Amino acid sequence: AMPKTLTEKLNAIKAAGKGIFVPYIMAGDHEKGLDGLAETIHFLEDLGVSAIEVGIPFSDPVADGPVIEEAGLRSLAHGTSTQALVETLKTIETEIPLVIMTYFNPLFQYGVENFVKDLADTAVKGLIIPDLPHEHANFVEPFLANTDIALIPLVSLTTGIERQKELIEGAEGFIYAVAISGNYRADLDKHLAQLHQVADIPVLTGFGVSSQADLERFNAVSDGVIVGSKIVKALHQGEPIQDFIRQAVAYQK
Amino acid sequence: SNAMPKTLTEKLNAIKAAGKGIFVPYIMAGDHEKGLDGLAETIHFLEDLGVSAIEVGIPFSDPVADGPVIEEAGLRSLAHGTSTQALVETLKTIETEIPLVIMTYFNPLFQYGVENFVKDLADTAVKGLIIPDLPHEHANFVEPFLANTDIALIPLVSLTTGIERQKELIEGAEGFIYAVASGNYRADLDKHLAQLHQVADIPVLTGFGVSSQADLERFNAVSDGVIVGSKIVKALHQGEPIQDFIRQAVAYQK
């Protein structure tokens, strides 16, 4: 198509028998932060550089909190890789359905289609991708079409009900309710119950369950609970957690 | 509908229908004395307690491979409140005849929205894009959005992994080619650089550590030019002299 101006400009320098010189700078690494970027660029322009590489600093998307953040670091230090996890999961036989929770990047690096196909014969029945926006569900949903893997949607309890209906339309597996300042104190119990009524599949409460009291409260207004930090921490530190789980599983009505 | 209903929905509905609460523990895969080899043990432990399902976390691994100087520069930048959104806005402000090449890992791009990012830079000095951790097989996530634009997607080509293998990357290259890798008898790099140089239809630049004029001249003998990263970032930060080095480098004639 239309030739790109960067190719043209570099070809011209080469054609003139001059060496191409491209400095790299980190955007925002300046006394004035991003307000220093123009100054740096013009400084390099004045010296007649061919082009300038402008780096964007990398921030991770992990928002799970310290207990789980540390568990991830321990896991990586044991040499855990996505590929090795998939292979290990093929090994494991269980009647319990497994739900994979991952951020998008590891999935993307592995290959979404590959990941789904490689788990076809496993105990994996669900997939949660916390940083995948609803508008970009097409990155995963097509590959789950013929499979036994449900894409679980994360639904914010504080958003309007029409928005929640949109998120959960065509949802499979279950609905993961999340609740994240403001002079307005939201009644979480009310919102949870409202979501519960509206949904055609099970609604689980996925925040703030650390005690039997928490567990009973949320079971009154939903189908159940997801418990993360407490279990991860207990397993790591060797605290007994059997009693808590036994009691939780035995919740009736 | 016409498709088979998912087993997870059925299993959870059955627990609910029995009037029992659903209970789902989360575990981090690999967080065990035995690492991944402990996963089965943990799952069976939870199965024995009659949990409804198990959430199995995948650890997130950092993609940054830039080295200490640039790693530190990133942390400084973040501590100044730098965001992708603010960078884009700042770039709309900047007028320059020099073409700018954005280097980013995929995740920040993904978070921003690839299409948004490209459209938001449409009228700016950005003419190139480098995404070190974008696998060639998944170039469809970016390439389509660059189709009608003036932004070239620059490929990283490894000199060690053999040029013919990376034929697809090189043939479908725009902007320039970023090559990555008398003494030490690893003169395989010189040979590979020269081979890549002949085969390429656009300029080939060296992205090995250039820290001296000697480094610069060596690579210019077998390529069209160099990219200089750590040396410049460190010098700007530490107030080391850099103007002379750049002046000399820009002026170099073979």
- The 3-class secondary structure across A3-57, one letter per residue, is CCHHHHHHHHHHHCCECEEEEEEECCCCCCHHHHHHHHHHHHHHCCCCCEEEECC
In chain B, count H helices and then E strands: 11, 9
Best mutation target, A5, A14, A22, to test chain B (most B CBs within 10 A) = A22
Task: Specify burial of residue B182 (Cβ count, 10 A radius: 0-12, 13-18, 19+).
Answer: exposed
Question: How buried is B181 (Cβ within 10 angstroms: 0-12 exposed, 13-18 middle, 19+ buried)?
Answer: middle
Of A14, A72, A219, the CB nearest to B224: A14
Which chain B residues are Cβ-neighbours of A173 within 8 angstroms? 6, 8-9, 12
Q: Measure the CA–CA gap between A90 and A122, rounded to whole angstroms.
A: 5
Nearest CA distance, A34 vs chain B (angstrom): 6
Instruction: Give long-range contacts, CB 8 A cutoff, 24+ apart: A150-154.
Output: A150/A125, A150/A126, A150/A174, A150/B6, A150/B8, A150/B9, A151/A126, A151/A127, A152/A99, A152/A126, A152/A127, A152/A128, A152/A176, A154/A128, A154/A130, A154/A178, A154/A206
Task: Count the helix, strand and coil residues of chain A and give each as a percent rounded to the nearest 5.
Answer: 45, 15, 40
Amino acid identity of A124? V
Report the distance separating Cα A103 and Cα A95, nearest Å.
25
Give the β-pairing of B126-130 and B152-154: parallel
Q: Are the beta carbons of B80 and A51 separated by less than 8 Å?
A: no
Please give the backbone phi and psi of residue B163, each rounded to the nearest 5 degrees, phi first: -70, -35
Tell me whether residues A22 and B111 touch, CB distance under 8 A: no
Of B24, B106, B174, the CB nearest to A105: B106
Cβ atoms of residues A46 and B46 within 8 Å: no
Phi, psi (rounded to 5 degrees) for A151 = -85, 110
Q: How far apart are CA A42 and CA A45, in angstroms?
A: 5
3-state secondary structure of B160: coil
Interface test with A, best of B1, B4, B6 (most A CBs within 10 A): B6
End-to-end Cα, chain B, rounded Å:
69
Which pair of structure tokens corresponds to residue A123? Answer: 């105990």
Q: Do the Cβ atoms of B23 and A223 come within 8 Å?
A: no
Return the axis-axis angle of helices B84-93 and A37-46, rounded to nearest 10°. 50
Nearest CA in chain A to B128: A6
Chain B residue at shortest CA distance from A6: B175
A34: tokens are 């991003």
Domain assignment of residue B134, given as a range: 1-254
Question: What are the residues whose beta carbons fall under 8 Å from the beta carbon of B215, sequence distance 6 or more?
Answer: B208, B209, B226
Residue B6 is nearest to which of A33, A72, A150, comparing CB atoms?
Answer: A150
The number of angstroms, rounded, from the C-alpha of B184 to the middle of its chain's C-alpha atoms is: 30
For residues A156 and A161, give the distance between their C-alpha atoms in angstroms, rounded to a whole number: 10
Chain B residue numbers touching A128 (CB-CB < 8 A):
55
Give yes or no for a contact between A9 and B242, defined as CB atoms under 8 angstroms apart: no
Task: Give the count of Cβ contacts less than 8 A between chain A and B.
Answer: 438
**Across the interface, which of A1, A59, A215 has its CB nearest the CB of B78?**
A59
Retrieve residue B138's tokens. 């998944």
What would you report as the CA-atom Rg of chain A, rounded to the nearest whole angstrom? 25
At which residue do the structure tokens 């190139």 appear?
Answer: B128
Q: What is the C-alpha to C-alpha distance for residues B231 and B224, in angstroms, rounded to an integer?
A: 20
- Token pair, residue B125, equals 């000095």
Instruction: Answer for the pair A167, A193: CB distance below 8 angstroms, yes or no.
Output: no
First to last CA, chain A: 66
CA distances from B134 to A211, B96, B108, B141, B196 (A): 43, 28, 12, 9, 21
- Report the distance separating Cα A250 and Cα B90, nearest Å: 57
Record: contact B110-A104, CB cut-off 8 A: yes
For residue A214, count other CB atoms closer than 10 A to its CB: 17
How many Å apart are CA B135 and CA B63, to the nearest integer? 13
Q: Tell me whether residues A101 and B254 touch, CB distance under 8 A.
A: no
Alpha-carbon distance B199 to nearest alpha carbon in chain A (angstroms)? 15
Residues of A whose CB is below 8 A from B84: 56
Give CA–CA dist A218/B24, Å, rounded: 13
- Grouping H, G, I as helix, E, B as strand and the rest as coil, residue B159 is coil
Which distant-in-sequence residues (6+ apart) come within 8 Å of B36 by Cβ?
A78, A79, A80, A84, A85, A88, B29, B30
CA distance linking residue A102 with residue B58, whole number of Å = 5
Amino acid symbol at B107? N
B126-130 sheet: strands from edge to edge = B152-154, B126-130, B100-103, A52-55, A20-26, B225-228, B204-206, B177-180, B156-158
B9 by DSSP, 3-state: which? helix
CB contact under 8 A, A128 and B78: no
Count of beta carbons in the 10 Å neighbourhood of residue B217: 15
Contact A24/B99, CB-based, under 8 Å?
no
Query: Number of folded domains in chain A?
Result: 1
Chain B residue with CA closest to A217: the answer is: B21
CB contact (8 A) between residue B225 and residue A68:
no
Do B215 and B209 meet the contact criterion of CB atoms below 8 Å apart? yes
Say which of B55, B80, B101 has its CB closest to residue A33: B80
Q: How far apart are CA A126 and CA A149, in angstroms?
A: 5
The tokens 């703030």 sit on which residue?
A208
Q: What are phi and psi of B215, to 5 degrees?
A: -60, -45
**Residue B70 and residue B62: Cα distance in Å, rounded?**
15
Quick check: helix, strand or coil at residue A185?
coil
What 3-state DSSP class applies to A128?
strand
Is the Cβ–Cβ distance between B135 and B166 less than 8 Å? no
For residues A179 and A157, the answer to whether their CB atoms sit within 8 Å is yes
Ramachandran class of B179: left when φ > 0, alpha when ψ lies in -120 to 50, beta otherwise? beta
Q: Which residues of A140-165 are buried (b: 16+ CB within 10 A; e: fewer)?
A: beebbeebbbbbbbbbebeeeeeebe
CB contact under 8 Å between A172 and B86, yes or no, is no
Hey, which residues of A are catalytic here? Answer: 53, 64
DSSP class of B3: S
Side chain identity, residue A62: V
Contact assessment for residue A21 and residue B246, using Cβ atoms and an 8 Å cutoff: yes
Q: List the one residue out of A146, A72, A25 whose CA is nearest residue B57.
A: A72
Q: Please tell me the distance from the alpha carbon of residue A14 to that of residue A19, in angstroms, as a whole number.
A: 6
Partner residues linked to B129 by β-bridges: B102, B153
Q: Write out the catalytic residue numbers of B.
A: 55, 66
Sequence-separated (6 or more) residues with CB below 8 Å from residue B211: B230, B231
Nearest Cβ partner of A51 from B29, B35, B101?
B101
Tokens of B212: 């001296």
Closest by alpha carbon to A43, among B176, B89, B98? B98
Return the beta strands (E) in A139-222 as ranges: 150-151, 154-156, 175-178, 203-205
Residue A146 Cα distances to A99, B5, B103, B109, B243, angstroms: 17, 10, 38, 30, 60
8 Å CB contact of B9 and A202: yes
